[PDB]
Design a protein around this ligand. Structure first.
Ligand SMILES: CC(C)NC[C@H](O)COc1cccc2ccccc12
Ligand SMILES: *[C@@H]1O[C@H](CO)[C@@H](O)[C@H](O)[C@H]1NC(C)=O
Ligand SMILES: *[C@@H]1O[C@H](CO)[C@@H](O)[C@H](O)[C@H]1NC(C)=O
Ligand SMILES: [Co+2]
Ligand SMILES: [Co+2]
Length: 434
């Protein structure tokens, strides 16, 4: 797709800290851009929609190539339309924003310039951030993660995409998303099936796959750390059901691992670590600092800080595994006790190491789940299982919670605030900010 200018595009500024092994940190100035799927896609010479509701214009978009030629992505009114605001090192994302139309959530990427994404090499480094999840109830996910996207949004590889990173193109994750309206400079109108429960989305004949590092997927009730490997490290298109993921009828038939090796303290047995109020180790009604370290072995370490008190990831005992480090032994023990073969089939942490050794783009989002009501994160999943089934209970939310239309109606003012992002060598982000 191309870019249009009927609505101006001004990326909300966001500062972060780059720290060094020497003990000091320096401020970096970047910005955030909303993903192409949330934007208004219209004709290049008029204001006629190429996509409206969950359907494509059959005349402007008869096939994927002609659609990309006749259509363009326009600018976003971040605050008034999408409920996205920034202030210094802080980013706030509202749940439901009412303007001329209703908008639900947003998916944002950190930029290096107004036309390029910021790339981070996670291996050997650590990522720290502050988060306020107090206004996030059951069914919502305030996510901070990394994906192996191209810095230009895919422009150099696919010239029919001239919109690029400036307009949030080139997204991919481990679910190999088929809901994307534009993949590889072409539309996704061919094979498009409108969502039966979402008036704004659908599923197309193409999907976009790549490695995904879920540093943070959470709400006020539950939180999870999940690395997801793929046989092909970076962005790659997939065909129909051969994609795998949430959008396909078989989630394990593709090139990526849609499950991942998840570490959820509640799911592993510590139901007293994370929750609302002083009855938990980490009080989710207050701001908390989350630090994630990627040592060169490929293992992931984690610690938290709240009110000056430091807590390492809680120890978990699963099978022959014992400890608090997310390593190969944890992931193998998880598959043995909770079930599944997806993580190991795709290569485990050894394959995932190829992703963290390369560049990855920072993604910050807020969304509800139209496929599984976020039950996989904060409730009992599958719903017919009990606590007697290993790893079934992931949180205290009811198996009846998270219905999109209901949470959108009941908690429209829900929000997540990500702040004070610090990045640098392991053991360096706890030093003074510059
Ligand atoms: C932030 C988001 C892109 N991360 C999603 C992770 O890939 C995990 O995905 C998922 C894992 C298990 C079930 C699911 C159901 C619906 C949607 C996603 C699911
Ligand atoms: C949960 O983890 C915290 C922090 O490590 C610890 O203090 C607490 O004792 C743990 N509780 C249980 C029941 O494991
Ligand atoms: C839950 O339902 C699934 C699908 O019917 C089934 O495979 C599984 O055995 C059920 N579990 C229980 C505890 O009934
Ligand atoms: Co094709
Ligand atoms: Co280690």
């Amino acid at each position: 797709q191309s870019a249009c200018t009927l609505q101006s595009e001004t990326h909300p500024p966001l500062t972060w800290q780059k720290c060094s092994s020497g003990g000091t940190c320096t401020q970096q100035t970047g910005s955030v851009v909303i993903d192409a799927n949330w934007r208004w896609t219209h004709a290049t010479n008029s204001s006629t929609n190429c996509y409206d509701g969950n359907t494509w214009s059959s005349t402007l978009c008869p096939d994927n190539e002609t659609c990309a030629k006749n259509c363009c992505l326009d600018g976003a009114a971040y605050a008034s339309t999408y409920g996205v605001t920034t202030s210094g090192n802080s980013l706030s994302i509202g749940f439901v924003t009412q303007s001329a139309q209703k908008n639900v959530g947003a998916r944002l990427y950190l930029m290096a310039s107004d036309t390029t994404y910021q790339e981070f090499t996670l291996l050997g480094n650590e990522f720290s951030f502050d988060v306020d999840v107090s206004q996030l109830p059951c069914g919502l996910n305030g996510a901070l993660y990394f994906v192996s996207m191209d810095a230009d949004g895919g422009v150099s590889k696919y010239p029919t995409n001239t919109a690029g990173a400036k307009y949030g193109t080139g997204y991919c994750d481990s679910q190999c998303p088929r809901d994307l309206k534009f993949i590889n400079g072409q539309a996704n109108v061919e094979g498009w099936e409108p969502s039966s429960n979402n008036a704004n989305t659908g599923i197309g004949g193409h999907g976009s796959c790549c490695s995904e590092m879920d540093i943070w997927e959470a709400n006020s009730i539950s939180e999870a750390l999940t690395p997801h490997p793929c046989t092909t490290v970076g962005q790659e298109i997939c065909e129909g059901d051969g994609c795998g993921g949430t959008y396909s009828d078989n989630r394990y038939g593709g090139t990526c691992d849609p499950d991942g090796c998840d570490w959820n303290p509640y799911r592993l047995g510590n139901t007293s670590f994370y929750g609302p109020g002083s009855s938990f180790t980490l009080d989710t009604t207050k701001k908390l600092t989350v630090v994630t370290q990627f040592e060169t072995s490929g293992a992931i370490n984690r610690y938290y800080v709240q009110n000056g008190v430091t807590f390492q990831q809680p120890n978990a005992e699963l099978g022959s595994y014992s400890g608090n480090e997310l390593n190969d032994d944890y992931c193998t023990a998880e598959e043995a006790e909770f079930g599944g073969s997806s993580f190991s089939d795709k290569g485990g942490l050894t394959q995932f190491k190829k992703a963290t050794s390369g560049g990855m783009v920072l993604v910050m989002s807020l969304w509800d789940d139209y496929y599984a009501n976020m039950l996989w994160l904060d409730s009992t999943y599958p719903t017919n299982e009990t606590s007697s089934t290993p790893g079934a209970v992931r949180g205290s939310c009811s198996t009846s919670s998270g219905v999109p239309a209901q949470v959108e109606s009941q908690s429209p003012n829900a929000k997540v605030t990500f702040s004070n992002i610090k990045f640098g060598p392991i053991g360096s982000t706890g030093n003074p900010s510059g």
